[PDB]
Amino acid sequence: MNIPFDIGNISGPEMGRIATPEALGRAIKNAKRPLLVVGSEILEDGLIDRAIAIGKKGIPIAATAHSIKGFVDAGYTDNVYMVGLHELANNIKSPDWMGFDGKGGYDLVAVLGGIYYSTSQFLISIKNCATDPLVRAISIDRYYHIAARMTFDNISRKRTDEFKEMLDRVVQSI
Amino acid sequence: MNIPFDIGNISGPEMGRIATPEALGRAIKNAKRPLLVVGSEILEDGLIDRAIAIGKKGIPIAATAHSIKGFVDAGYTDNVYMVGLHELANNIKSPDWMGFDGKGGYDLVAVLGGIYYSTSQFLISIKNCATDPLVRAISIDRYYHIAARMTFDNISRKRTDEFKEMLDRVVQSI
Amino acid sequence: EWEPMGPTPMPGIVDLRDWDYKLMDRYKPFYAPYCEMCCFCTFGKCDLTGGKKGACGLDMTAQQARFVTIACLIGCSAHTAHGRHMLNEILHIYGDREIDMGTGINIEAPLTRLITGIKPKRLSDFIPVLDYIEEQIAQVMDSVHTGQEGSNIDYESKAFHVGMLDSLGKEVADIVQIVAFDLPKGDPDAPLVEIGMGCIDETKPMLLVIGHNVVPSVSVIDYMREHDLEDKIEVAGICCTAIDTTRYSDRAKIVGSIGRQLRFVRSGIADVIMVDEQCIRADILEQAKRTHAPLIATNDKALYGLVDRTDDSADDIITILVSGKEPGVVILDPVKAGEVAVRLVQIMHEKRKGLVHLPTDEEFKEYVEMCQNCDANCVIACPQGLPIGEANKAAAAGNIEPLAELFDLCVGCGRCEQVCKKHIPIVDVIHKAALPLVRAEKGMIRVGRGPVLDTEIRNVGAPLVLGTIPGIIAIVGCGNYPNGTKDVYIMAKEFVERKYIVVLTGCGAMDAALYRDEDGKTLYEKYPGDFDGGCIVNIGSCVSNAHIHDAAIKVASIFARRNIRANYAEIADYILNRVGACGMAWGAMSQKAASIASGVNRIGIPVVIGPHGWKYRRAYLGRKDVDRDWMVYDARDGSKVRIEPAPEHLLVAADTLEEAIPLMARLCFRPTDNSMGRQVKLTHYMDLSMKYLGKYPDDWPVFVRTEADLPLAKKEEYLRILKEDYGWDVDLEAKKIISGPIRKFDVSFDATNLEQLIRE
Amino acid sequence: EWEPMGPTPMPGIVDLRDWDYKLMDRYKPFYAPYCEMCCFCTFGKCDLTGGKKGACGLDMTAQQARFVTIACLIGCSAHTAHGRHMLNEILHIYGDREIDMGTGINIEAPLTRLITGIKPKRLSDFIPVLDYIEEQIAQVMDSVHTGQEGSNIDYESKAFHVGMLDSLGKEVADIVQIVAFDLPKGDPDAPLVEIGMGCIDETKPMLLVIGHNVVPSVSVIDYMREHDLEDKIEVAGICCTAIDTTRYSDRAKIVGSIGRQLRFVRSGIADVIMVDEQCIRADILEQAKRTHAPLIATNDKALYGLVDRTDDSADDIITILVSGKEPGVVILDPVKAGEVAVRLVQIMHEKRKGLVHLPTDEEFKEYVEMCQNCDANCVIACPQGLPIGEANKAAAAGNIEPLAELFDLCVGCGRCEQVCKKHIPIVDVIHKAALPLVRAEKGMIRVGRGPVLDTEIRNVGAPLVLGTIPGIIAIVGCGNYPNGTKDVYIMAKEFVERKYIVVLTGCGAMDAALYRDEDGKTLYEKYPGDFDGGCIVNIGSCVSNAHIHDAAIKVASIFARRNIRANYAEIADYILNRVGACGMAWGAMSQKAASIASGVNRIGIPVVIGPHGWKYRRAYLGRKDVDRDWMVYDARDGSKVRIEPAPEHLLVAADTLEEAIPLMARLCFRPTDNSMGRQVKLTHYMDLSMKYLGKYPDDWPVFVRTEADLPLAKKEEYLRILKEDYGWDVDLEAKKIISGPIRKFDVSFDATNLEQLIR
Ligand code: SF4
Numbered sequence A, B: 001m002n003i004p005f006d007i008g009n010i011s012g013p014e015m016g017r018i019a020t021p022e023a024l025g026r027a028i029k030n031a032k033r034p035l036l037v038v039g040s041e042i043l044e045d046g047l048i049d050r051a052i053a054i055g056k057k058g059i060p061i062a063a064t065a066h067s068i069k070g071f072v073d074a075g076y077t078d079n080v081y082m083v084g085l086h087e088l089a090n091n092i093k094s095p096d097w098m099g100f101d102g103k104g105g106y107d108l109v110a111v112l113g114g115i116y117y118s119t120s121q122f123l124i125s126i127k128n129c130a131t132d133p134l135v136r137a138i139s140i141d142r143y144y145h146i147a148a149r150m151t152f153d154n155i156s157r158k159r160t161d162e163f164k165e166m167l168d169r170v171v172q173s174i
Numbered sequence C: 001e002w003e004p005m006g007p008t009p010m011p012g013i014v015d016l017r018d019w020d021y022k023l024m025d026r027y028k029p030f031y032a033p034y035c036e037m038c039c040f041c042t043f044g045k046c047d048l049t050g051g052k053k054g055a056c057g058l059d060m061t062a063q064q065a066r067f068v069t070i071a072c073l074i075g076c077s078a079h080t081a082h083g084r085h086m087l088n089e090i091l092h093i094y095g096d097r098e099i100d101m102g103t104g105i106n107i108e109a110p111l112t113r114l115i116t117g118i119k120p121k122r123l124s125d126f127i128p129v130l131d132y133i134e135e136q137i138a139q140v141m142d143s144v145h146t147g148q149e150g151s152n153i154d155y156e157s158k159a160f161h162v163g164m165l166d167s168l169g170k171e172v173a174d175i176v177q178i179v180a181f182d183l184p185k186g187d188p189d190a191p192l193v194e195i196g197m198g199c200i201d202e203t204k205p206m207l208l209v210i211g212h213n214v215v216p217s218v219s220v221i222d223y224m225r226e227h228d229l230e231d232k233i234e235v236a237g238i239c240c241t242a243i244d245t246t247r248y249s250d251r252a253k254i255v256g257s258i259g260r261q262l263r264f265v266r267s268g269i270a271d272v273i274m275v276d277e278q279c280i281r282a283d284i285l286e287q288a289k290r291t292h293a294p295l296i297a298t299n300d301k302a303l304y305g306l307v308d309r310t311d312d313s314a315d316d317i318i319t320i321l322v323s324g325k326e327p328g329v330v331i332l333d334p335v336k337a338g339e340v341a342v343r344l345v346q347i348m349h350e351k352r353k354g355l356v357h358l359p360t361d362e363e364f365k366e367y368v369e370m371c372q373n374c375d376a377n378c379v380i381a382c383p384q385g386l387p388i389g390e391a392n393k394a395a396a397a398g399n400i401e402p403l404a405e406l407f408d409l410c411v412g413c414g415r416c417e418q419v420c421k422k423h424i425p426i427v428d429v430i431h432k433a434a435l436p437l438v439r440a441e442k443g444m445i446r447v448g449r450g451p452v453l454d455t456e457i458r459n460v461g462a463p464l465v466l467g468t469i470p471g472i473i474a475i476v477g478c479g480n481y482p483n484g485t486k487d488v489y490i491m492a493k494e495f496v497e498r499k500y501i502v503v504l505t506g507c508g509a510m511d512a513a514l515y516r517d518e519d520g521k522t523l524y525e526k527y528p529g530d531f532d533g534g535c536i537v538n539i540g541s542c543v544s545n546a547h548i549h550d551a552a553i554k555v556a557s558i559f560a561r562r563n564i565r566a567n568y569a570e571i572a573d574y575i576l577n578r579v580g581a582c583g584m585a586w587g588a589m590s591q592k593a594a595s596i597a598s599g600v601n602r603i604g605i606p607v608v609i610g611p612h613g614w615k616y617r618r619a620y621l622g623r624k625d626v627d628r629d630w631m632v633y634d635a636r637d638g639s640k641v642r643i644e645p646a647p648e649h650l651l652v653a654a655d656t657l658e659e660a661i662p663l664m665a666r667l668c669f670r671p672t673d674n675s676m677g678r679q680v681k682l683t684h685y686m687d688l689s690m691k692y693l694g695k696y697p698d699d700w701p702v703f704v705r706t707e708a709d710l711p712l713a714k715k716e717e718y719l720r721i722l723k724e725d726y727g728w729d730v731d732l733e734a735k736k737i738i739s740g741p742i743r744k745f746d747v748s749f750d751a752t753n754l755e756q757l758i759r760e
Numbered sequence D: 001e002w003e004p005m006g007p008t009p010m011p012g013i014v015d016l017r018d019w020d021y022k023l024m025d026r027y028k029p030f031y032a033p034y035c036e037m038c039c040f041c042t043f044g045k046c047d048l049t050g051g052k053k054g055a056c057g058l059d060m061t062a063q064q065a066r067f068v069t070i071a072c073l074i075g076c077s078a079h080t081a082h083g084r085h086m087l088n089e090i091l092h093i094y095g096d097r098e099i100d101m102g103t104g105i106n107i108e109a110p111l112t113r114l115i116t117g118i119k120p121k122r123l124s125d126f127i128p129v130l131d132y133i134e135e136q137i138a139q140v141m142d143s144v145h146t147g148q149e150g151s152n153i154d155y156e157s158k159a160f161h162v163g164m165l166d167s168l169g170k171e172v173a174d175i176v177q178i179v180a181f182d183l184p185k186g187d188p189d190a191p192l193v194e195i196g197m198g199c200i201d202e203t204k205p206m207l208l209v210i211g212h213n214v215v216p217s218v219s220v221i222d223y224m225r226e227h228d229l230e231d232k233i234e235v236a237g238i239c240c241t242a243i244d245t246t247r248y249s250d251r252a253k254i255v256g257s258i259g260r261q262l263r264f265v266r267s268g269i270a271d272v273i274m275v276d277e278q279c280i281r282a283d284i285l286e287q288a289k290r291t292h293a294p295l296i297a298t299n300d301k302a303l304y305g306l307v308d309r310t311d312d313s314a315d316d317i318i319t320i321l322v323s324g325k326e327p328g329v330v331i332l333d334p335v336k337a338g339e340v341a342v343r344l345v346q347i348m349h350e351k352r353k354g355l356v357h358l359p360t361d362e363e364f365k366e367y368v369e370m371c372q373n374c375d376a377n378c379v380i381a382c383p384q385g386l387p388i389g390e391a392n393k394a395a396a397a398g399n400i401e402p403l404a405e406l407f408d409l410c411v412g413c414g415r416c417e418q419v420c421k422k423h424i425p426i427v428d429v430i431h432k433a434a435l436p437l438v439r440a441e442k443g444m445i446r447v448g449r450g451p452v453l454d455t456e457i458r459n460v461g462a463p464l465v466l467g468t469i470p471g472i473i474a475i476v477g478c479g480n481y482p483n484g485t486k487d488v489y490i491m492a493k494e495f496v497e498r499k500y501i502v503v504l505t506g507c508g509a510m511d512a513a514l515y516r517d518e519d520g521k522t523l524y525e526k527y528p529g530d531f532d533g534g535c536i537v538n539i540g541s542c543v544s545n546a547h548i549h550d551a552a553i554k555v556a557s558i559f560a561r562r563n564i565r566a567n568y569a570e571i572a573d574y575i576l577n578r579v580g581a582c583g584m585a586w587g588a589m590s591q592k593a594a595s596i597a598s599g600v601n602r603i604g605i606p607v608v609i610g611p612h613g614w615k616y617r618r619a620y621l622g623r624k625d626v627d628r629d630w631m632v633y634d635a636r637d638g639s640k641v642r643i644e645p646a647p648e649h650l651l652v653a654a655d656t657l658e659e660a661i662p663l664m665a666r667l668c669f670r671p672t673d674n675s676m677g678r679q680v681k682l683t684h685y686m687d688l689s690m691k692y693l694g695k696y697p698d699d700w701p702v703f704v705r706t707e708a709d710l711p712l713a714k715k716e717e718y719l720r721i722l723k724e725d726y727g728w729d730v731d732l733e734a735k736k737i738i739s740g741p742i743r744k745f746d747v748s749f750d751a752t753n754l755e756q757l758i759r
């Protein structure tokens, strides 16, 4: 049983597949131009350390909401870009958008530490509009993102220690 | 991957469970007042033999559509009742309805040989309106009935041999 | 003045609520939540499964009722806005026209008089009718906003109110065009016109019109008549614009129903496609471009991103279109649009000559061979679950009949092609395999007659209410059929052969015209067009459905001598208790179809729909076993009488033709039937049940009150069955029923559901 | 001829389509299919995932545009029908009246003049205006029928058109009630009224009004004045009826916004509940019955299965309700409804003493102890994902703070309780834990002032267009907030302190009034109610939003001497290019909120919404990187000029207060800002970005055309940053920028999107 964080978020027939941490990490690793997208929930439970560890593997970070403050506070802002989740979605689905370095779009988008119902709609946008060239959107967050291509199952906040073991396995697999 | 006969028939979060033929059989066996519901597709593939085998175990049959013609031609009309699928749904969810014998409602409804999209809505009526007393509705048909409580997965018509093998196992288990 | 003002002039939501509860107390709403969720506001998405309440407090059943209300509002708005637009232009282009419906009709608009209390004299007098409907539409739309109605019953009532407004909106539209364009006014000998995919002369420039608004096609015909081009250009339509066009000119033809639209467009027979509004393929621009056919959009409901060239000269528009610089244009001036279409189709005919659109033999062979016979791809996307893969493999092995058989079962939706990785154009492959049959689809249909003549009402009124004319059968609705277009033909043919009054509209009227009997006659060729028993009547387009309600109203006023002015409840109750009638929308699909059924139901007429009709979510079903639900007053003394289930249901979905035909007969029973009428109606119900179901109905005796009710030919075995099989107390020797009937028979039973009609 | 008839009188669907394309060529439609299917016809249900077309030919994006069109049509109908209903009642009960907005206003109805070309003189002159709207509603609804429009863009235009009709319907409804009931007509010193869960005097008979239609409440107040009962009965409201009622009587009070409705009703403080239409809990009959409060329904939009007793005597209705043989009644006669409510609340007040509605201490303890701390039940059903289970266990262990914190985050929807097998009344358990804070919820709000005065337009016009007043900040909309009600308060506070013109309406205005600063004052107590920089203004209820449109129109008419009669496109283009403004619907929820945003967007004003706003499926987002999307005409000679993204977006959803506030400032930039005005706006944008995000925006130099545009205090550091971090050619010695800016500053640059305005 896969439980979407909002039980009514049954969008349609193509539902996110449950993936191991190692498979989610290898998808980021296999991507030519991946993008880590983080939201306001990255500012909690020492989650920004994982984002920074991912970024330091050479992966740009889209810091949405007010997540940029935690990167500034943490002392890691290189290759981290402030942007709204909304405009980010519109830009990722736009084949003419040359990205944050001006070199091109992103083939893989991975979400982490985002407000569920907005992040989900950000994923549904890419799933339904970023089709050619195909952009793969995955979730390494604590939620079962039915709108992602691949995702973890729901991990309750009182089991956050379990989520951190799984996320750490994602980082080691990149 | 469970495939609903209409890919768009994603009704909500409570999705019918894949069950073994033995489990579906035992649910009919355990019922106090089961009812077999057959539609116009029972008139094909010698499927009425399976319906008659079920009826002959002491179980009433609701012959929807024009399936009563097949029961007349087969020589088995005892405990078989002519009824519309729509009125049948309204009747089953009505706690004051005393059934075809006048002794009470039915606690288990099993569909077989029915037009997919109308039988599915028949099942969804029961799932959503026959809640107190709870009526359990199951599918022993060739379709994944996402609106059933328990159901088989999709068996294509060119694999009707396999479907018959499973349906026969249901009969054996009643 | 002309009649006393009844109690419900221009009713609001609550003005007829008590009548709705009379209907719903008997035929309670039934719900099947196709979607168990709600997406309408940002508190959602709300899961309502199992009867839960949304984040606004609205419970699941009330959301279903809210959903059908929205669907009814979309249908009601479609008909009302169609009438308003037509009026606005007729008054501007041609001018006001006195309403003259002929010497054989005194009540011009029964529905208008019934609901508003207005006696319209000129077209301009319909403006206040439209003002009332449009104000009401906004009142009820306000009701579907979050945090409004919480009772599902009151929502159904609101839906019923929208339905009534839809029947009025339909009437305003048809009479407006009938009057402005001098369409037939009840013509029993209305001309017959050609219909079918194979009735088009491909040798002539072919102008195809799609939609519902005829104003632009009137200018096409008038332009053709002015320059003597009626023999030179082939003008045909798809959906109701076709019916309204042939009502104006019997020199035009009809291609077919909604299900046929995609296949004809893809055939590329049309050189120019002029669309207006409603039931038009939303990808018509892409489809027209594919076949090198310019698209002319004439209505602001559907512009397709095209440039608005209403103010451009016809010369310049034609230059733009012939040049191909733009694939289509918007021309909201129908006079100009007609000129462009007629001038352009002549130029394009030559330019498009030689083009090929369907697969060649070699392309066909490649497609069927590459098919992977996937277990669950295209068949799963198909709303009819057609066995496309197997058909493909058969054709690859030399048998194209399986594919050819799919052509009529297919409703031309295009969903199958989009899940096929091999990119097989399944819709075109089926068409190709069936070319021979498509080319032979050549029917004949009587043009839309419009109203029923007061003379016809005087002839059928009494025998209809007595039952000796066993009922009005109204075959209407869209073409989302479960199993092809012949079902509605068999329905009309079966009931006309039994001397019912068979009327048709919209796609149903079209599809019933495609088939021929052993004598090669279509139903419209074989049977007269009078509104009389044993006749076939094409009432007209979907808006023409209002003439059926009008016929039932005229019975109450002409035969029963009831006042109709602003007197809806009384007439509806009269129709429900005395007028044997049943609607049938075997392929009901649209929102207009939902609003039509709602307005037909509220005036007291039951409607059967096809198995796709479950997807509307709501139905109105009776409990024939619940005695308290079937009490009717005897208006003579006020006593309460428990009646047979007649009609048993108000809105019900059947699964197959074989189930539907006996059910239609069953729903024509009425509590005021006399012995001879009940016998006529029961004869057909018993024989139709035995013919299509192979057994008499399990509860047939319920419709037997005395011996004079049983069919004459088998009165004795029927008597024996009643005694030996139903435990009735019958003296077979004397041919007398002693006990068993649900009630005694009385020719003067004054059946009514309304306390206000009780005299003592 | 007061003015020449403009080109777009009583416009239809295609009459302003070209203006919509100007908007949409820049702010293109963006789609997030919350539902990837369509259920509208029997050919369905269609799967549109991945851009597929339905069984009718309609593709995914066009279906999304149809969906939002339906939403807007529902919202537009709600406002239009509200006004029609009020007008009909008013004309029958009180008669026709001359529209007199006071001597401080000449243009009575700017939007009416702008759209219809009509200069209304009497209330009855709004009948043809409503006739127009209602006809258009039916036309566009026809467009949403299967087999109609196939272009997503043309459907967006139909939604924009419906949004404009909504702004007109809002103006009619409010002008009508302002004139008919002598509500304030732009009063800068309008009275203050008490607001909040805790401002109700429970020792007096308490009548609760819920909805949007104030006509039955006028009869309540009128009846109370005639019988000298204004000091004996406590009359308070929830949602906009509370705003409109306090506009009639400064003796009434406001309980609060939609999020508070269920909790207040569940509290049982109300002896009688009188509802009308819109934003009412659909289970209000259930909830009233549970607290033994009779329900009086006064509008046909919402009958709840109750008996229509409009024709019965007030005596007989009271007898029925007092005796309990019916839990409520429908009374469609507002005069009778008012009499019944006032007479009934005095009787029920005595009968309801001794009842207990919220859990006791022991019951509360049993509830939190029996909770199973389910991993994924109540939290999954909750739209905000609140930690109810963990909060319950903390309370069971003696810590109720976690539960109490949830009261304000909760939006009173009730979904959590329905998935709890333990049958815990979660909503009431949070309330009990927060009872102390609920009872202390005592705020102060200025009454709905309605229109902006002509003198105020003349005072702010130039500083607003030039930019030295950094913008109009309009905090409006529903209360489906992501993180409680204090966010909107913090936005209003931050912008008023920075001398923006801060206006509020509906639930937003309510929620901003619940908080007090270090000196114990609500925003409405601390700041003036003038339409001016550094002022807080409660424009009024949700229909009062139209006064914001009207203010921007009057700026174009009074300060720029533009004609407005049937001249919509020219005025909208003026507002988009010169009027710094930004809407904020942080908790946007309803269909009325979608049509409000559409009508605001069509006249050229951007709107930010909260993270739940993704659920509307459609947004309007700019691509600041696409040069050809930001071309405007210099009306002086017809040349084309690439402009900074100002505003960058038209309808955009933000996730957190800390993202939203810098965004709002950003969305106030306009191409016609002078050096001082841009400098004011840029000072706030840069400081707000540093305050809330901890870093200056990555692309802030886009808003720098010259050194004079630079904030004064850090000008030298900004010049260095421009040189060394952005590679601009800047002479640090001369403190002058040589190259880098997007365009040269030209005070005479006449920016417009309209070819017809080229001279
Ligand atoms: S309208 Fe009601 S049921 Fe629908 S999504 Fe909104 S809160 Fe939920």
Ligand code: SF4
Pocket (backbone or CB within 6 Å): C381, C382, C383, C384, C385, C386, C388, C409, C410, C411, C412, C413, C414, C415, C416, C417, C426, C427
């Ligand atoms: S076009 Fe025909 S075969 Fe294809 S999915 Fe539609 S109905 Fe089925």
Ligand code: SF4
Pocket (backbone or CB within 6 Å): C370, C371, C372, C373, C374, C377, C378, C379, C388, C389, C390, C392, C419, C420, C421, C422, C423, C424, C426
């Ligand atoms: S999806 Fe295509 S390849 Fe597969 S069975 Fe259908 S037509 Fe053949």
Ligand code: SF4
Pocket (backbone or CB within 6 Å): C035, C036, C037, C038, C039, C040, D035, D036, D037, D038, D039, D040
């Ligand atoms: S199926 Fe229909 S009602 Fe359900 S979520 Fe989708 S659009 Fe909304």
Ligand code: SF4
Pocket (backbone or CB within 6 Å): D038, D039, D040, D041, D042, D043, D044, D045, D046, D053, D054, D055, D056, D057, D058, D063, D146, D147
């Ligand atoms: S309106 Fe179109 S997309 Fe929607 S269910 Fe009908 S055919 Fe499908």
Ligand code: SF4
Pocket (backbone or CB within 6 Å): D381, D382, D383, D384, D385, D386, D388, D409, D410, D411, D412, D413, D414, D415, D416, D417, D426, D427
């Ligand atoms: S009532 Fe409050 S706690 Fe419960 S689901 Fe709604 S928002 Fe969440």
Ligand code: SF4
Pocket (backbone or CB within 6 Å): D370, D371, D372, D373, D374, D375, D377, D378, D379, D388, D389, D390, D392, D419, D420, D421, D422, D423, D424, D426
């Ligand atoms: S569903 Fe009920 S028992 Fe479970 S965590 Fe929530 S309040 Fe506790």
Ligand SMILES: [Cl-]
Pocket (backbone or CB within 6 Å): C574, C635, C750, C751, C752, C757
């Ligand atoms: Cl009668």
Ligand SMILES: [K+]
Pocket (backbone or CB within 6 Å): B005, B006, B007, C379, C380, C381, C382, C383, C384, C385, C386
């Ligand atoms: K299927």
Ligand SMILES: [K+]
Pocket (backbone or CB within 6 Å): A005, A006, A007, D379, D380, D381, D382, D383, D384, D385, D386
């Ligand atoms: K949740």
